Amino acid sequence: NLLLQYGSFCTQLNRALTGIAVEQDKNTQEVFAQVKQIYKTPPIKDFGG
Amino acid sequence: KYIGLTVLPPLLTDEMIAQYTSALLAGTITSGWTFGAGAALQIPFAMQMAYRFNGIGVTQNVLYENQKLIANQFNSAIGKIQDSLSSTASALGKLQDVVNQNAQALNTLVKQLSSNFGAISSVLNDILSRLDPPEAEVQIDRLITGRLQSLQTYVTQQLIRAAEIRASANLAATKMSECVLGQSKRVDFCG
Amino acid sequence: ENSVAYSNNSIAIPTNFTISVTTEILPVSMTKTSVDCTMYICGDSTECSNLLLQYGSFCTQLNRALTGIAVEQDKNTQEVFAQVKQIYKTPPIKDFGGFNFSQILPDPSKPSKRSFIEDLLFNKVTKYIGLTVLPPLLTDEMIAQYTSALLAGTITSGWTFGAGAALQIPFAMQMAYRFNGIGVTQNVLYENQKLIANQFNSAIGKIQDSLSSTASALGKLQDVVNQNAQALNTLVKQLSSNFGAISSVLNDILSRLDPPEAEVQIDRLITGRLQSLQTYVTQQLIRAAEIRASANLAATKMSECVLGQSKRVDFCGKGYHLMSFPQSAPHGVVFLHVTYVPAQEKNFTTAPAICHDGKAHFPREGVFVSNGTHWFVTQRNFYEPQIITTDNTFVSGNCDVVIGIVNNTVYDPLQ
Amino acid sequence: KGIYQTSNFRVQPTESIVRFPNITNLCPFGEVFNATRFASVYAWNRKRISNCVADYSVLYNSASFSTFKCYGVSPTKLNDLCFTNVYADSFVIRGDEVRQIAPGQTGKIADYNYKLPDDFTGCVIAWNSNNLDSKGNYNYLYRKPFERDIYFPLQSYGFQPTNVGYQPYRVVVLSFELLHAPATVCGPKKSTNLVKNKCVNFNFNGLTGTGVLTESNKKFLPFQQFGRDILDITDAVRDPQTLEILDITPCSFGGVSVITPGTNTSNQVAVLYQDVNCTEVNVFQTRAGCLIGAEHVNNSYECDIPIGAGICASYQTSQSIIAYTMSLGA
Amino acid sequence: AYTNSFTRGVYYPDKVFRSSVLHSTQDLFLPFFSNVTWFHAIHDNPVLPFNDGVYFASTEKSNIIRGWIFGTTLDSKTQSLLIVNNATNVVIKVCEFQFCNDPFLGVNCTFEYVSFKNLREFVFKNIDGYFKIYSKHTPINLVRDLPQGFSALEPLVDLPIGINITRFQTLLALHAAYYVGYLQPRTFLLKYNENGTITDAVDCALDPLSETKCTLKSFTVE
Helix, strand or coil, X not given: CCHHHHCCHHHHHHHHHHHXXXXXXXXXXXXXXXXXXXXXXXXXXXXXC | CCCCCCCCCCCCCHHHHHHHHXXXXXXXXXXXXXXXXXXXXXXXXXXXHHHHHHHCXXXXXXXXXXXXXXXHHHHHHHHHHHHHHHHCCCCCHHHHHHHHHHHHHHHHHHHCCCXXXXXXXXXXXXXXXXXXXXXHHHHHHHHHXXXXXXXXXXXXXXXXXXXXXXXXHHHHHHHHHHHHCCCCCCCCCCC | CEEXXXXXXXXXXXXXXXXXXXXXXXXXXXXXXXXXXXHHXXXXXXXXXXXXXXXXXXXHXXXXXXXXXXXXXXXXXXXXXXXXXXXXCCCCCCCCCCCCCCCCCCCCCCCCCCCHHHHHHHHHCCCCCCEEECCCCCCHHHHHHHHHHHHHHXXXXXXXXXXXXXCCCCHHHXXXXXXXXXXXXXXXXXXXXXXXXXXXXXXXXXXXXXXXXXXXXXXXXXXXXXXXXXXXXXXXXXXXXXXXXXXXXXXXXXXXXXXXXXXXXXXXXXXXXXHHHHHHHHHHHHHHHHHHHHHHHHHXXXXXXXXXXXXXXXXXCCCEEEEEEEEEECCEEEEEXXXXXXXXXXXXXXXXXXXXXXXXXXXXXXXXXXXCCCEEEECCCCCCCEECECCCEEEECCHHHCCCCEECCCECCCC | CEXXXXXXXXXXXXXXXXECCXXXXXXXXXXXXXXXXXXXXXXXXXXXXXXXXXXXHHHHCCCCCCEEEECCCCHHHHHHCEECCCCEEEEEEEHHHHHHCCCCCCCCCCCCCCECCCCCCCEEEEEECHHHHCCCECCCEECCXXXXXXXXXXXXXXXXXXXXXXXXXXXXXXXXXXXXCCCCEECCCCCCCCCCCCEEEEEECCEEEEEEEEECCCCCCCCCCEEECCCCCEEEEECCCCCCEEEEECCCEEEEEEEECCCCCCCCCEEEXXXXXHHHCCEEEECCEEEECCEECCCCCCCCEEEECCEEEEEECCCEEEEEECCCCC | CEEECCCCCEEXXXXXXXXCEEEEEECCECCCCCEEEEEECCCCCCCEECCCEXXXXXXECCCCEEEEEEECCCCCCCCEEEEEECCXXXXXXXXXXXXXXXXXXXXXXXXXXXXXXXXXXXXXXXXXXXXXXXXXXXXXXXXXXXXXXXXXXXXXXXXXXCCXXXXXXXXXXXXXXXEEEECECCEEEEXXXXXXXXXXXXXXXXXXXXXXXXXXXXXXXX
């Protein structure tokens, strides 16, 4: 009931930390998710050596 | 670390991160760059390093005249990576730095729970046991105003730090686009 | 999930392409806010202004910090769009070898002469106590002249207008340079030219349908407009919070109270509003570095991707890159990155080298492949077989030197 | 050489407009302050005051009072206020107990019977009353915010004229209800005539401000006192003379910026008044603001000093600062 | 007997104009979709508690319900609020009233005031001793229920009664049916429209969607 006298700080601080916590999955998606199929290797590893 | 502080899980779990690096890598090994540019085209690996040699102006016959030597050098060079990563905890010092900073920022944030800020105590429930509101509001005004400043501090540190990690994530998505899904002409960009 | 059909003897070569026009939206600037921090903290009050002067430099450096942002929104907009020292324009006739740019070049039927695609972008993108907005230096009409210059250079002259004096070249020949940039041998352009024009034109059709049908196509720009407006709503709401004063209506505190009382109350509204202003300006400084890192990236795609042909895989949108066209958007830019994508494989048997007159031979361009019965040399990124000759190939070593070599005739152009 | 943002300018209020209701009743404070018998604090008395005009000068300049302490308003400024209701609370106590009557105090009166709210906004007024209420007068008697209640919890005084704070003190608390609603109690300040379309200082029913008053097209409901904008601030007010609806607009303001070639080139300058029409302020109007002392030129050049919305300025030939639409190049 | 209140019991919370804006406030309201007690006035009716404050409504065409009583003990030892409609005026009194065996209208005192095809809604609440009446009149054909649809109650009075209330009852023109609901301090979101009329509202404790609408301050959620 005192913190409410300071207004929109606590909600904008939640908004700010959510702007970080949503973009951590944007960063992790834009780095790793560059391939639209999960490719996999054959059973035999004939890579010329 | 349990007073209102939380850690959310990542959307991509470390097993799905490892499936994507396995898909990036199984593409890079079996199909070269082509899986970035469109539908993944398979190509034998003795032909893929011959494309990389043409990409550095070294004529493709230099691979085939030396294929076993180049492969034995490559297998040796990968062999050294395991020794490096066994002995050299400081090589990981760029990941361990970020993990140390975001532990240190939360340690600092919880240290600031215990600080007085000019209130009688940092133990808010014990002030609320000691005092009636005409008195307690003067003391809790300081604890609120100090903790509010300590979040506006921590969240400014985390925003400034997020722009540094996001420059690194776009640099990592660029390295992944050019040097994994491709080959880079950019001298001293990829080794 | 896809088990790739790898083996030591097998290659897939694409027999056909699609010339996909993609879309990349970048913020370039944001709203040039200018806050009269004394009229925000102390609006109309001499009694409050005389207290704000006790807090020293802050209102001066808050004006300095916001003017530092507001000056550079025109630095960002000039660095992204003013990459050309003359305003080029197309001729009246549009003889571009079948390509239809009428939707991306200016429409004269408008009071601000934007393109048809810019008129979609300007529709899909969407407070008076001391806060104000300064105008952008360049009007969005001047931004529509600069995108038409960058675009009328790009349509008539290739990279050359960014690399010195602009030099005209027929557009069907600039695309033969663009095909050489990706390692496709240009006879593949002319022997398919109308198909390439129709795919560019049909992909341009899909861009309009996308921007007409889907609001989230502008999502990255609209999110910047929403962040700036939501930070202004949040800054203005905070004029009315008590911060622990008797009230938040400042002239009602000053009418109710004599100075010995009032200077205690007003210190709470100043130290509250000033913390709420330093919060706003710090949010704007970090958000300006997020938009400036996007202005330097949009400047860099204007340089490498419009004024050039970037060799950087997946930088100029998904695919092998051909060229890009800039369209303006409110507070941003949109690049229509034209990417070549290989689209229809066949599986071929292959060998790293071929042995003929005891000596080994290797191709000058691309790879050896076989349909099983015949041996060919062909380019990397498009299937076109050629019966192998010493003009296609060069010599080293002998059959014993190599792993995976095959015994076949290499033809003699001199016979 | 540049443009430098030296000042911000505000169109001044021309004159002051006070617009209270045409109410004429003089309030019954005299009935409370001159009543013969007062109540015992254990069952303290109360009286509404509403729909009347309140000259506090008569009370504040009276020598009859030991105290006049006010806890959210200053007694000097009361005549410049208007509010919904007063509520006067009336009782008698020992003088040694009067100091308990404050907006958060504790004591045998204040904690157990006549508790003031933690945010009480009124005035507490008291005096010694020995030459009135002493006899002994055993009838005067003592026992949560504004609570009421029926070896029992009741203790009497017994005031005798031989009793300084041993005496009976007679006490009145005025509890001003400064809600934003229909104001019914105002200070003595006369309402002016009402001015329109021009910048004025104003006060409507106690709602102070400065701005331009314009006749609104806004729809109205009979209980509306005032109206607010899209963000939480006063946009409109009901006129209490007769019930028309006026806007308020902030008196026109903008940044003032000096265009100059460098002092090594010249001492001549031009001034931009941002975001204002020149009729509020050789002269030119731009989308950036009113521009004064610069010379408007139909030619176009590279942008030397940038102004805004395609306009730029430079110093040229007989010399002057010109301002022009920028050429983007050859 | 009961019915569902649906959207009913929304009223202008303060004497301020707002337009085109989605204001949110905490005050005593009838909670959305709550059960309302439905009373047949004929065949004699009970006295009720009053709790924090009361929503009251009647459905009408001949106007048989013509007042109310509010108080604590209703026995002349407590002061009580009486309200009556004499067809020409609303008439309001508070007194040390002594009460009839069963009060009806035959077709000290310390305050006074003076002025099925219909639905009439009234809201009664007490605020630190200051008592507010809000109301609406609207046409209907729904003879047996409350309309699932939006209407808003505008104020009529502030009564400076200074009096505690815990009990109430309605008054009848003895020579029909009515509803009662009870208010609670639920937070609300209130759409003031392009004219400044309160056209739509959300109860910020009905369901998780309604708590989302109050988090975002929006009647639409993507």
